[PDB]
Symmetry: C3
Subunit: 345 residues, 3 copies
């Protein structure tokens, strides 16, 4: 008896995002999405460590869903018979029934259809939450993604100015808890169930073994670096379902940042580093001003460099020597400065 | 020589709050509170682990004190002779003398009276701080609570609109550091003094063994779930004297959130998850829109599910199918969708 | 071909700050700074633990640089031949080339000159970042500081009111990762290179052994406490290049706080505790209202009291009994209150 037009959305794997409008003149629709749970072995680091992952749609993170304020979101959650345990979904964007979790518990072989009204604007986490200690285990096994609820007039700066992005990426950050043997080597398991007890022991100490973007160390570097061009305004949505993060674009800034991720709040301007509280998504716009490689990290640099949490942007364009220049290339230190430099020891 | 009316306040145990007005037409008063230090053995988890706690008024957290801007707060701190060590109090709401700590050090058998002017609006931590390494030990042994300094016109949205709560709860979150023996079992001690050396070693590694609301895992679930009704605007004050938290109302939102907890700042709107920086209190309003069970957690879900940091609300009322509905109950996956679902692996 | 006046700045060791104007009527200048890298053994705690530090200008943190919006900042980075490895610099204030890191890699015996335009107002981290796992190692070995880019009209409250400080201090917070032997004693090394492998193992577990201000436990206490006077408005800049912090002025507040550190954003008012996200600087103003000792901490009190993260202010002036008073000094508990006090157990 909800008498609105239906609009079917085909999700795409992160860090890319399905087609959508920012500002729209469409009225509310029933926006139809399908998420299929896949338990699978995944590679999580550069040394080939494997992990018995649990995912929405086969990815870590799960895909970004994009709708507008006042849309209804009708989600078909599917739990294929090849999976081994029950799964459900909690949308932080939704109101009631534990975000949908109390209405979406499905055994392998089942599917369920949940509808929730998009009454709250922002980027939000969604994640599996089957009950009790399965909640954090499913989440840190990979069962989390995000949904973006745009205002119908698109983003604004909180001061009556339209903001429009030329390009959007979704960076899901994942804390992983991989058991080690007595020698310190990561252990392999044949099934998520078999990994559980040893994994819970690692989780209890609250220190991840890996902190990764798009499901693995190096996922968003090399061949898979994120592309942009000088002059493009890029929206970077960052989610972390379980653990804090502090995103930073090395060589750039956050021109407009919704740290808490909710578009009813004016963004902060000109940030160096922002903060994603665990259990949320945030978003930053940046207009690229310089070409070259940028590193996008969590700015616990140990996590970024040593536990997997670095992405790269490769930005095409022309260097701006006014914003930054190498005045003198590396050269031998001159002897006339010896005394003066002795004051800086 | 302070010539103001005196108003005696009877504190109540958390998560409840003593009677108070939001908006008031009273002038400044000397608001009189008594806190009695109690060192006692307490049960902190569902498996019956005990802990040599140190508390204000016998609870973790200590009770919420509520006053208005411009009140004077006259605190009688009592340290009964049955206690074993000196205690004092630091009010983050207060100006000078280390928040009062430098004026309130009392041995067992003594009491002291401190007055501080409520010049700063917000929710604030108070905690014991006797000196040196006793400061964190007393705090993580339970000696912390909060005080709320309301504007005399009550809360506002920072945009000239009154906000009024129908119901207030105080959620004190406590990080606990319980030693284990060689087998991993929590160790028991006969006195706080005896627990100290082993406890300090756990504290030094910065990883709590337990993270609890209202002093124990499960405190605010079952018989002790928090009650509300659809339509009620509920203020949830959350404090953490030592360690960060990221509160989230599962199935709800923060309609108005003062993350940093200070009412001279406009609240943020529509948050999924907020952030309580260790050593502070914050506050969130929410108007319940749906009945049923809600989980209120720190959204490090390992802490929430596995270390004790889950509360429940039980909300009475009528379900709103417009905000959320189960369109189709769990059903066998249909064979016609096989090919299409293969794209989501 | 940049045709602007040159202004040479002599840096001073933290927590002090070189001479500068807040509001200025000068036009843009090329502001000339020199940073000299010094690898050296440093003492980091009260028990005399040593550490093979790597620094800018011989200090942890590196010195605070102060410029105005629209200045160009011409940095001569020097890597003396007595050092053992390559170093560079990333300015979070700068746009392009990984903050300057991709233009400033210098071997021992070399120097380089980088110019970056100060287009972004705020306090910002700068740090070494030579590549890969050297990035966090160099940073947590001490190679970080901060730069402040003031608006040309000085600070404002975001509501068209000038804010002016009478006194500025720069508090650099440093997370340190010092290996221990089998007995738990901190280990000593002859060179940074020799310390690396054991240090990386500690870094990987994300738990610092020490958390210090101005490079060592106790640095800013006793003889080196920070001075102020009642009535002075003090700007406290706090940076943390790698790890979150939650600053708190015990006995005071943050009157105006830029938690994220960027002056294009209105400050928050009346904070108890604020949050420095790792990889950033923030800033707080406070006008002292009371004399006496204040403790300035990170309000993980375990870090503050037990891992080194306490500074002191010594504030001269007259006590204000209206803001706070000891109404009654410690006295024996009276027998008439016995029954009533039994309700607070
Ligand atoms: O009390 C509401 C409770 O039920 C859920 C599902 O588990 O939504 C349902 O609520 C009622 C059942 O008690 C019905 O009125 C409604 O039709 C049903 O969908 C939860 O969302 C909520 O927690
Ligand atoms: O980390 C402890 C210890 O384990 C070893 C192998 O014994 O390496 C493991 O840990 C490294 C750090 O996580 C990984 O790079 C590697 O994949 C894993 O086998 C040692 O090398 C290390 O000292
Ligand atoms: O310098 C102030 C210092 O003293 C305290 C108490 O320990 O408040 C006191 O301050 C003065 C004593 O030096 C007196 O003028 C005043 O009467 C007294 O209460 C501290 O609050 C402060 O740190
Ligand atoms: O946690 C390590 C190890 O210790 C054991 C008992 O040897 O359990 C202890 O730790 C559990 C997790 O904190 C608690 O649930 C329990 O109360 C405590 O005795 C093992 O079961 C566990 O592997
Ligand atoms: O693609 C830009 C890239 O180069 C750097 C230095 O490593 O700045 C340089 O950029 C170009 C070289 O590819 C030149 O046009 C420019 O002169 C030069 O300084 C980096 O900052 C940036 O990442
Ligand atoms: O901390 C573990 C263990 O090591 C010892 C010496 O064996 O002390 C070391 O650690 C202390 C805490 O960091 C330091 O204060 C000290 O400098 C260091 O040698 C033990 O005393 C302690 O139990
Ligand atoms: Cu699941
Ligand atoms: Cu959640
Ligand atoms: Cu105490
Ligand atoms: Cu405190
Ligand atoms: Cu370096
Ligand atoms: Cu950086």
């Amino acid at each position: 008896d909800l008498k609105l037009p239906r609009q079917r959305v085909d999700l795409v794997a992160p860090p890319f995002v399905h087609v959508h409008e920012q500002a729209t003149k469409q009225g509310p629709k029933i926006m139809e999405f399908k998420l299929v749970v896949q338990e699978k072995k995944m590679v999580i680091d550069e040394k080939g460590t494997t992990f018995q992952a649990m995912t929405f749609n086969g990815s870590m993170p799960g895909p970004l869903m994009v709708v507008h304020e006042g849309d209804y979101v009708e989600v078909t959650l599917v739990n294929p018979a090849t999976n081994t345990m029950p799964h459900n979904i909690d949308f932080h964007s939704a109101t009631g029934a534990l975000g949908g979790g109390a209405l979406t518990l499905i055994n392998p072989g089942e599917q369920v259809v949940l509808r929730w009204k998009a009454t709250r604007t922002g980027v939000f986490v969604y994640h599996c939450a089957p009950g009790g200690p399965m909640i954090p285990w499913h989440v840190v096994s990979g069962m989390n993604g995000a949904v973006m609820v745009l205002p119908r007039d698109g983003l604004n700066d909180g001061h009556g100015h339209s903001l429009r992005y030329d390009r959007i990426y979704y960076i899901g950050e994942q804390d992983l808890y991989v058991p080690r043997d007595e020698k310190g080597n990561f252990k392999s398991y044949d099934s998520p169930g078999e990994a559980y007890s040893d994994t819970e022991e690692v989780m209890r100490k609250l220190t991840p073994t890996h902190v990764v973007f798009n499901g693995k160390a190096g996922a968003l570097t090399g061949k898979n670096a994120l592309n942009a061009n000088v002059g493009e305004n890029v929206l970077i949505v960052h989610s972390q379902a379980n653990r804090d993060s502090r995103p930073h674009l090395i060589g750039g800034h956050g021109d407009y940042v919704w740290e808490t991720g909710k578009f009813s709040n004016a963004p902060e301007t000109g940030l160096e580093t922002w903060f994603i509280r665990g259990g949320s998504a945030g978003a930053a716009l940046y207009k690229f001003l310089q070409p070259g490689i940028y590193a996008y990290v969590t700015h616990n640099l140990i996590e970024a460099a040593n536990l997997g949490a670095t992405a790269h942007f490769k930005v095409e364009g022309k260097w701006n020597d006014d914003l930054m220049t190498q005045v003198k290339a590396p050269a031998d230190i001159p002897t006339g400065s010896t005394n003066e430099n002795l004051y800086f020891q």
